[PDB]
């Protein structure tokens, strides 16, 4: 209502007591604000990391100690610069350099020449992403002086079964020769030799027109197949087309596995097939193409 003048003496002090107290609390808060600052300088921790061990290829790296699978930088002999790759390292010192992986149809494999040349998709330490390493790199890895490589293909259906196919002296030519595929011979495998072609019981030359040894890489915008038409364009992929194929690991990813003629835009089988193991109308659930020095594949 209106304190007596005698109150003024007390009130003046009260304010000073808390004013100064407020002041101290601030001097202290700012201190804590400064301590908070040192706590907020680092970036979010990235789960995906790249190991420090590098070499000419995944096998070379593993021979250098590397024990676990994940991302590594390799740099083949004739390579201008190093490049990232995924290395699958088993418990026997074997370093596989994976170059193609399918497993969910998350990555669209309908890419052009350059895309198939430089590569596309994503590399993951856990080896759970789809991708195409890139023709040039694949060429560089498989054509290093005196080091003969081998290719292992791995398929897996939607029922849980898995199969493989090996090829000795695997090799991919330079761009000048449209990255031609060549191998000394089928090394065996329950998945069956599909690169040897397949007898679709439609022609006298059975196997021949769907064989891959020696085929040049082909893309919709760069046709180098043995067909007046365009295999790569009609099947919507990038592959060593013939007229057209028996093995199509870069084909369209069909959910479920069992697709039909009606599913295809044009009409021909364009799924992730491999005739020596599944009907041309059965698209694999998973797929992986990896290479390693041949002397390593159990001699």
């Amino acid at each position: 209502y209106e304190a007596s003048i005698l109150t003024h003496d007390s009130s003046i002090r009260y304010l000073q007591e808390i004013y100064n107290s407020n002041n101290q609390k601030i001097v202290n808060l700012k201190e804590k604000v400064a301590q908070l600052e040192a706590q907020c300088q680092e970036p979010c921790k990235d789960t995906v990391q790249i190991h420090d061990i590098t070499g000419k290829d995944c096998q070379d790296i593993a021979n250098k100690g590397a024990k676990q699978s994940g991302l590594y930088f390799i740099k083949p002999l004739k390579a201008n610069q190093q490049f990232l790759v995924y290395c699958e390292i088993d418990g026997s010192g074997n370093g596989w350099t994976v170059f193609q992986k399918r497993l969910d149809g998350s990555v669209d494999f309908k890419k052009n020449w350059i895309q198939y040349k430089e590569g596309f998709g994503h590399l993951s330490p856990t080896g759970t992403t789809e991708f195409w390493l890139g023709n040039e790199k694949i060429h560089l890895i498989s054509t290093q002086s005196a080091i003969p490589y081998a290719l292992r293909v791995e398929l897996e259906d939607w029922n849980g079964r898995t199969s493989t196919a090996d090829y000795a002296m695997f090799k991919v030519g330079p761009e000048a020769d449209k990255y031609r595929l060549t191998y000394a011979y089928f090394a065996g495998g329950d998945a069956g030799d599909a690169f040897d072609g397949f007898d679709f019981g439609d022609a006298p030359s059975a196997k021949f027109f769907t064989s891959h040894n020696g085929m040049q890489f082909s893309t919709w915008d760069n046709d180098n197949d043995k067909f007046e038409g365009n295999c790569a364009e009609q099947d919507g992929s990038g592959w060593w087309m013939n007229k057209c194929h028996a093995g199509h690991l870069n084909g369209v990813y069909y959910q479920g596995g069992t697709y039909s003629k009606a599913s295809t835009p044009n009409g021909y089988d364009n799924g992730i097939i491999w005739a020596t193991w599944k009907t041309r109308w059965y698209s694999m659930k998973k797929t992986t193409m990896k290479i390693i020095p041949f002397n390593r594949l159990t001699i």
Binding site: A203, F227, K243, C244, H245, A246, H248, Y268, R280
Partner: peptide, 4 residues
């Protein structure tokens, strides 16, 4: 994929 065997084209005709």
């Amino acid at each position: 994929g065997p084209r005709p």
